[PDB]
Nucleic acid binder design. Structure first.
Ligand SMILES: [Mg+2]
Ligand SMILES: [Mg+2]
Ligand SMILES: [Mg+2]
Ligand SMILES: [Mg+2]
Ligand SMILES: [Mg+2]
Ligand SMILES: [Mg+2]
Ligand SMILES: [Mg+2]
Ligand SMILES: [Mg+2]
Ligand SMILES: [Mg+2]
Ligand SMILES: [Mg+2]
Ligand SMILES: [Mg+2]
Ligand SMILES: [Mg+2]
Ligand SMILES: [Mg+2]
Ligand SMILES: [Mg+2]
Ligand SMILES: [Mg+2]
Ligand SMILES: [Mg+2]
Ligand SMILES: [Mg+2]
Ligand SMILES: [Mg+2]
Ligand SMILES: [Mg+2]
Ligand SMILES: [Mg+2]
Ligand SMILES: [Mg+2]
Ligand SMILES: [Mg+2]
Ligand SMILES: [Mg+2]
Ligand SMILES: [Mg+2]
Ligand SMILES: [Mg+2]
Ligand SMILES: [Mg+2]
Ligand SMILES: [Mg+2]
Ligand SMILES: [Mg+2]
Lengths: 129, 384, 61
RNA sequence: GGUGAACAGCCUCUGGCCAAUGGAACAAUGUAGGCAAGGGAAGUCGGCAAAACGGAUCCGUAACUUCGGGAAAAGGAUUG
RNA sequence: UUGUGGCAGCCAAGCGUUCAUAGCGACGUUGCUUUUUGAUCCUUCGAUGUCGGCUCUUCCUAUCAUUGCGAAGCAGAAUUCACCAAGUGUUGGAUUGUUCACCCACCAAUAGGGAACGUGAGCUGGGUUUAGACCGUCGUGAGACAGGUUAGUUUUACCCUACUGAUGACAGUGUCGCGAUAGUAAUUCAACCUAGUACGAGAGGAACCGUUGAUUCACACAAUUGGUCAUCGCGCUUGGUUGAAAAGCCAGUGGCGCGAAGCUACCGUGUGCCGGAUUAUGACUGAACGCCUCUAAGUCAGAAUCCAAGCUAGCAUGCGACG
């Protein structure tokens, strides 16, 4: 499966919504598959599927939790190649529980270990890198 | 008054007490079991922790994402001059445990080991083993030596050899006196172990005899010393809020009103570091034997003629001129610390255990600072 | 071996090292170390820091 | 005296001092002061503490209002 | 003490589409427990610091999950009842000063409990519990409120012990060992293949082995990335000051950019364990009882269990070989 990479997005984080659904801004509230430990805030990385509400966006998307997938994070992370790769902005995309891209396209690069892990965000991405 | 919320314990109780180790050399507390059918061989060795570098290798692991992919790994270098076998011990089993049946020492003994027997060598008359050396220039002394050997052949169940490193072929240390230990022989019958030792007195055993490639070993040695260091650091307890009277970095409740005592399991402030530890399943990637083309860091892929020592020498240690091991992962103790390599105790069987390593590159850039070249001659040709 | 070339000092990265920043315009900068990366983020111009290979080849040194 | 709007702060001259028990070392915990990757109140009773803003020139300045205010509102730009 | 609170039995009228007992189980009844409260007033009023949260540890089983099992109104998936089990786990948050409660989300699970309703010379002082003040009802009033509101000091350890670490005397001194005993640490999940298979009319729909990672925890390490600066290392720069350039210096570290080294981080890395005894249960041979029978005698398989193996200390005022 996927390897382990630096966790960068705690809860209450606020990420760009990099797709053509209309939402401008996701808001991380909780992460799939995470088991906690006293006081430890759940954290997301590239490829982790989170729950997120929209705080600034289309009126008909707001006020409801929705599965997102993080595609870009600014915290560095060490590849299994040696290189510490990262991005310029925190950003994720809406998905449905079965991992489908709700929208149609993703604006900009997406994490390589995000596209390879989600079979549809890979096709909706324009440039994997 | 249960706990509102649980959380797993801080610190392990399986590693107490935490005092200074009473031994600078990492002692072995158990040796691999004897298998009389395998031919006689050793089961430990002494190396010295030189420093760390990294590699990139080509993974062979079906089912992993890393398969046919290059991975970058840290590895630690152990400069590892051949031991000298200068003794022989027999151990005989009792209802109590093991007793030392008897012991035999070599006729010539190096200048540097016989310093191991003094707390003040220079002012001493150096007489250690002088009147014992003379048990080899007479018929009666030779007689009683062979009598000691027949005693050990005829009773002993466990045979061990006293070996010391040649500390002096590592000029990097400023240390003249040797380190010395028993390595327990394995395999063969007891007469074959005694033969293997006595045949091989006073001669040097190279680390290729002890270990092989790709084999997992354990490394045993004393950690770094970090001084008298408090609870948040030593035990890992979370810190208290900023706004507390009389300090933050402490355990708030050190126990209930009853028992009216402080438990051994509460976290207290005391010595951190310089402990004894064994850390198993560290793999072998490469043995560098001084005097063969395996010693330089030229793989079959890279060919830049460089030795293992990084530019400007290993920090705090110097330049590796001897034999060496190159093991995956970290190593206990700071630089210049002696580490006991010991054969594993399990039956290594996994795909990781069987996995064969072949490098493609060894970082050699000066580990002192952000290194950027491989070799002095390349830095020179780059500048002019 | 396969070398890389840093895009702020124009010097050659060796395997197992180097920090690749992936800018939102989808283009890849491969810094060499901390110093190059911090000058890049501070928006310094490589061609006018004296120690860079781009400066040096520009002025033909 | 200098900088500065200035009896602000920061440095200097006249004048006055080095009086506050000293020596060695850099362990925890403290007290006073800093800095931190990704996130930015999720900590907490409570944004307590700290950070961010701050001078000046130019522009622009809303609801409300006792029509006097709000007002340095907000939001911008420049500075050697 | 145990009415009250919680927890478990016996009986079996009925529910459970036919069928008291798969799962219930009314009418009665037998208890257990001592986290509530009631009752008492035995100790404490020349003072035992009084709610809660934070922190940290230990312990209990009346077991929520996890390991092995038994039963079913068990076809598969799920689920319900019970068994040995307390080894491991039990979360982030909105609201409330709250324990309690209630929601959102993740999760294998968000079970319940004690330790002077654990824990104030450990914090906090939100609540409460003085003096200020306000409202509402009562009082003619001084005032009252088990009504709501707002502001309201948190003192000492240097003593003994416990504990965590540090030296150390007791056959001269030094190496190399033994190992009594004490501690003990590993936990969990997912993905692929099995498999859209077994089962099932269809709907749905598994698991073992294997392979790859991951969670929680532990112990180390610093090559790589990140963090750190008073290397006052280099540079830039404000105000001043040395007739001036050069070189500095003063502003308790003047300020900024970078900054090796050292330390360091699930923010980086590496590793984490092998035999036997056995429980629950299923059984073998075989009686008592010509048959049957896992039990009476004798045996077997058997688990996150246990004890070792391993790992840590080994002044146990213990011991061995040798110089
Ligand atoms: Mg908490
Ligand atoms: Mg409690
Ligand atoms: Mg609990
Ligand atoms: Mg640590
Ligand atoms: Mg206080
Ligand atoms: Mg270095
Ligand atoms: Mg750095
Ligand atoms: Mg003026
Ligand atoms: Mg003034
Ligand atoms: Mg920060
Ligand atoms: Mg808040
Ligand atoms: Mg909270
Ligand atoms: Mg809050
Ligand atoms: Mg609140
Ligand atoms: Mg404030
Ligand atoms: Mg206003
Ligand atoms: Mg009762
Ligand atoms: Mg009752
Ligand atoms: Mg009373
Ligand atoms: Mg009293
Ligand atoms: Mg008291
Ligand atoms: Mg029980
Ligand atoms: Mg107390
Ligand atoms: Mg108050
Ligand atoms: Mg009052
Ligand atoms: Mg009142
Ligand atoms: Mg024990
Ligand atoms: Mg550094």
């Amino acid at each position: 499966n996927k390897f382990r990479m630096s966790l960068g997005l705690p809860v209450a984080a606020t990420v760009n919504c990099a797709d053509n659904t209309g939402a401008k801004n996701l808001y991380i509230i909780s992460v799939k598959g995470i088991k906690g430990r006293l006081n430890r805030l759940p954290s997301a990385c590239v490829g982790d599927m989170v729950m997120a509400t929209v705080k600034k966006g289309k009126p008909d998307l707001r006020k409801k939790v929705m599965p997102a997938v993080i595609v870009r994070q600014r915290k560095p992370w060490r590849r299994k190649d040696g290189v510490f790769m990262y991005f310029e902005d925190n950003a994720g995309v809406i998905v449905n529980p079965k991992g489908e891209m709700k929208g149609s396209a993703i604006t900009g690069p997406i994490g390589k270990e995000c596209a390879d892990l989600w079979p549809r965000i890979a096709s909706a991405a324009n440039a994997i890198v | 008054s249960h706990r509102k919320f649980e959380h797993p314990r801080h610190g392990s109780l399986g590693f107490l007490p935490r005092k200074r180790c009473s031994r600078h050399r990492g002692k072995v507390k158990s040796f691999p079991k004897d298998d009389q059918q395998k031919p006689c061989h050793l089961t430990a060795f002494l190396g010295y922790k030189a420093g760390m570098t990294h590699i990139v290798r080509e993974v062979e692991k079906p089912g992993s994402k890393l398969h046919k992919k290059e991975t970058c790994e840290a590895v630690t270098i152990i400069e590892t001059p051949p031991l000298v076998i200068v003794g022989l011990v027999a151990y005989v089993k009792t209802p109590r445990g093991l007793r030392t049946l008897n012991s035999v020492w070599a006729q010539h003994l190096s200048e540097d080991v016989r310093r191991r027997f003094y707390k003040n060598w220079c002012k001493s008359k150096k007489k250690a083993f002088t009147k014992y050396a003379l048990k080899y220039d007479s018929d009666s002394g030779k007689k009683e030596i062979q009598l000691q050997l027949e005693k050990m052949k005829k009773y002993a169940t466990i045979v061990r050899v006293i070996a010391h490193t040649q500390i002096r072929k590592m000029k990097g240390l400023k240390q003249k006196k040797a380190h010395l230990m028993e390595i327990q022989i394995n395999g063969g019958t007891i007469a074959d172990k005694v033969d293997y030792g006595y045949k091989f007195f006073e001669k040097e055993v190279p680390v290729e005899a002890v270990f092989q490639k790709d084999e997992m070993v354990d490394i045993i040695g004393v950690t770094k010393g970090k001084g008298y260091e408090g609870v948040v650091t030593r035990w890992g307890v979370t810190r208290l809020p900023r706004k507390t009277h009389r300090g933050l970095r402490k355990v708030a409740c050190i126990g209930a009103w009853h028992p009216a005592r402080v438990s051994y399991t509460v976290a207290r402030a005391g010595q951190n570091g310089y402990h004894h530890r064994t850390e198993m399943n560290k793999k072998i990637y490469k043995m560098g034997k001084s005097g063969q083309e395996s010693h330089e860091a030229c793989t079959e892929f890279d060919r830049t003629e460089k030795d293992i020592t990084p530019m400007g020498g290993f920090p705090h240690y110097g330049v590796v001129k001897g034999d060496y091991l190159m093991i995956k992962g970290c190593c206990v103790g700071p630089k210049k610390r002696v580490v006991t390599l010991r054969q594993s105790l399990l039956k290594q069987t996994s795909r990781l255990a069987l996995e064969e390593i072949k490098l493609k590159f060894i970082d050699t850039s000066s580990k002192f600072g952000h290194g950027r070249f491989q070799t002095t001659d390349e830095k020179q040709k780059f500048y002019g | 071996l396969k070398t890389e070339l840093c895009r702020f000092s124009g010097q050659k990265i060796y395997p197992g090292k180097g920090i690749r920043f992936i800018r939102s315009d989808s283009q890849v900068f491969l810094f060499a170390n901390s110093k190059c990366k911090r000058y890049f983020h501070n928006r310094l111009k490589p061609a006018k820091l004296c120690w860079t290979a781009m400066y040096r080849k520009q002025h033909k040194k």
